[PDB]
Amino acid sequence: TTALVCDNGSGLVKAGFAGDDAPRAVFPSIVGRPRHQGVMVGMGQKDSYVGDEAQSKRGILTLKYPIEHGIITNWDDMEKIWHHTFYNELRVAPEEHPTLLTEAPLNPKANREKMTQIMFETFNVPAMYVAIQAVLSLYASGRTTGIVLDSGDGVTHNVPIYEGYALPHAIMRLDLAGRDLTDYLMKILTERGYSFVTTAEREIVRDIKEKLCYVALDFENEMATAASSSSLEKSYELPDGQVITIGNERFRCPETLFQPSFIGMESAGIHETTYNSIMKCDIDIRKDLYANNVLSGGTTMYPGIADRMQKEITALAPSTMKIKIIAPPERKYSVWIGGSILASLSTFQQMWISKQEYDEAGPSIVHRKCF
């Protein structure tokens, strides 16, 4: 048989078979109810638009994300996301297919257990597994060691692994991620004059975020440049017209990753929670972690975050120590691709939570010897 390496995601959902390069089904995890009435009779529109079908009908929908910050907050939506994932995007019944889910570190126990209940009871998967979203991005990156920075769309967690042993205590989890950056770019495009309050244009400004934004190498020098020069004023075409010219709001959205004091987050940036995650480890394995710092996640695909990250983490580390960042150009899907390595291993066959192993011990089987 073949195992499906699913990925719940937080703004995109990717699902493909174990044994592929890239996932066969990548779409945003949205569920839209239609707000307006519909005067045309006999149209037969559904009560719930899910997935990429709801990305083409955005101006009529109330788009909702069932995964706010890692956690699933509405399970009746997430069941529709999975049902649309298996039946429409992949067109395979999960009765004869194992399923690899990927859940972030430090989630609630009830989230992982409830996810296992929804997989075994409703979909009747024969054997599913729940794997940690930062370790798979260490499989795909081809490193046995090194702190990995999985800055997802939903949540940003800085897991260290040395010689295949993850360090549980040093794992740092930060709520600030791509969703909150998109909310901050909604906050600072109002500073220019372009209002975005409706969630349907949440997908518009995020697309701005995909194209225009970049992590600047310095901040006060680039704020000294964009306030006087006009070389950074880059325009963008909305889907109706009224092209907008973003100047200093371009490198100011992704800087909130490195200055969480912009949005009132107490913590340090992910250039220092990486350093506090390395200093939390023992003082002899740090040398491989400073060399093997991995970046993954969609939020890490800004142009120039690998140089600003290296500049700040070099400014915090001892200067006699080599700093290297392994960031292959598939940063976004690296959580999936190692999953396609994970379920394809023959030694992983013992790791599946079987249904016979499930029904004997209920939903709390996930935190036992099988993970």
Partner 1 sequence: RFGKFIRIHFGATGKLASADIETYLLEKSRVIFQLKAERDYHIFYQILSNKKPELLDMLLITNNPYDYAFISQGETTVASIDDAEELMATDNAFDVLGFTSEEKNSMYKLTGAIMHFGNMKFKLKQREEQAEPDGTEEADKSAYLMGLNSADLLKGLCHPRVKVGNEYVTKGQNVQQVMYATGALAKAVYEKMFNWMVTRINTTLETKQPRQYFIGVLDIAGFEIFDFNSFEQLCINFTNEKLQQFFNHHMFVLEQEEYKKEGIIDFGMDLQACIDLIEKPMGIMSILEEECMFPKATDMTFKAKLYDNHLGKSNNFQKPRNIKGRPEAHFALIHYAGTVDYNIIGWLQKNKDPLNETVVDLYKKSSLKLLSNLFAKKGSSFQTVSALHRENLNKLMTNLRSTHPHFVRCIIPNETKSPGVIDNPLVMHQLRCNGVLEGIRICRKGFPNRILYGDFRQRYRILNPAAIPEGQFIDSRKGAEKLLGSLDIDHNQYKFGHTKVFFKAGLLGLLEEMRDERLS
Ligand X SMILES: Nc1ncnc2c1ncn2[C@@H]1O[C@H](COP(=O)(O)OP(=O)(O)O)[C@@H](O)[C@H]1O
State the binding site for ADP: 10, 14, 153, 209, 298, 301, 332
Q: How far is the CB of 245 from partner 1 (least distance, A)?
A: 26
Select the span of 40-48, 270-278, 292-300, 322-330 touching ligand X (CB under 6 A): 292-300
Q: Which of 6, 9, 157, 277 binds ligand X (CB under 6 A)?
A: 9
Q: How far is the CB of 104 from ligand X (least distance, A)?
A: 10
**Amino acid (1-letter code) at residue 61:** L
Q: How far is the CB of 127 from partner 1 (least distance, A)?
A: 14
Query: Is residue 35 packed enough to be buried (19+ CB in 10 Å), middle (13-18) or exposed (0-12)?
Result: exposed
**Residue 27 binding partner 1, by CB under 8 A:** yes
What DSSP string describes 119-171?
IIIII--SEEEEEEHHHHHHHTTT-SSS-EEEE-SS-EEEE-EETTEE-TTT-
CB contact set of 275 (below 8 Å; sequence gap of 6+): 313, 316, 317
Instruction: Look at residue 11 and give the partner it binds from ligand X, Mg ion, partner 1, none, a contact being a CB closer than 5 to 8 Å depending on partner kind.
Output: ligand X
Q: Which of 70, 94, 126, 154 binds ligand X (CB under 6 A)?
A: 154
Q: Considering CB under 8 A, how many residues would be counted as binding partner 1? A: 36
**What is the distance in angstroms between the CA of the first residue and the CA of the last residue of the chain?**
21
List Cα–Cα distances, 40 to 34, 37, 43, 53, 258, in angstroms.
14, 9, 6, 20, 50
Instruction: Look at residue 23 and give the partner it binds from partner 1, Mg ion, ligand X, none, a contact being a CB closer than 5 to 8 Å depending on partner kind.
Output: partner 1
List Cα–Cα distances, 163 to 159, 195, 289, 348, 357, in angstroms.
13, 49, 10, 18, 30
List Cα–Cα distances, 276 to 268, 279, 286, 371, in angstroms.
9, 5, 11, 27
Q: How far is the CB of 78 from partner 1 (least distance, A)?
A: 20
Nearer to partner 1, 21 or 121 (CB): 21
The SS3 call for residue 198 is coil
Nearer to partner 1, 116 or 292 (CB): 292
Instruction: Look at residue 341 and give the partner it binds from ligand X, Mg ion, partner 1, none, a contact being a CB closer than 5 to 8 Å depending on partner kind.
Output: partner 1
Tokens 């126990």 correspond to 109
**Residue 209 binding partner 1, by CB under 8 A:** no
Instruction: Look at residue 22 and give the partner it binds from partner 1, ligand X, Mg ion, none, a contact being a CB closer than 5 to 8 Å depending on partner kind.
Output: partner 1
Select the span of 40-48, 76-84, 256-264, 270-278 touching partner 1 (CB under 8 A): 40-48
The answer to whether the CB of 126 falls within 8 A of the CB of 98 is yes
Tokens of residue 98, six digits:
């194992």
**Residue 24 binding partner 1, by CB under 8 A:** yes
**Residue 320 binding partner 1, by CB under 8 A:** no
Nearer to partner 1, 96 or 191 (CB): 96
Q: Rounded to 10 degrees, what is the CA torsion of 108, 109, 110, 111?
A: 60
Residue 344: phi and psi, rounded to 5, are -90, -10
> Which residues are at the interface with Mg ion (CB under 5 A)?
152, 335
> Which residues are at the interface with ligand X (CB under 6 A)?
9-12, 152-154, 178, 182, 206, 209-210, 213, 297-299, 301-302, 332
